[PDB]
Amino acid sequence: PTSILDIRQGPKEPFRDYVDRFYKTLRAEQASQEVKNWMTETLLVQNANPDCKTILKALGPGATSEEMMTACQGVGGP
């Protein structure tokens, strides 16, 4: 009903709310698990807002979702 490709972080959207929308959409997404991990490695960071994208790149590719959310907890309104 929605596509993972449509999920992007609002300029003032708390990272936790963005991740939660992202993963909910991901769960609804039809795809192999390794394609789901790839969607997450590429799209989550790509479609984050300028401040969260910057922090997430400071973490780099190996980061866990908890590490991401705590590092960005952080910024935003709400």
Added chain:
Amino acid sequence: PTSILDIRQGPKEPFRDYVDRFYKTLRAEQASQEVKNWMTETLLVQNANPDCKTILKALGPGATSEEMMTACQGVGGPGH
């Protein structure tokens, strides 16, 4: 089985042979049609060999596959 994520063009592999494997694997993949479109636009280019990748970036997104194959025909080896 196999994943679309790992389909990669050989240094000498004819582009048409790479394309063939790519789309066979894409068709067998579980994924919405939008997502398959995005895979073609990102992975197909990303995992092409250096000479073909350069051509494909200049050619740009969509980008008919026949047109991609026409642009990459003179590239490389005779394949297997």
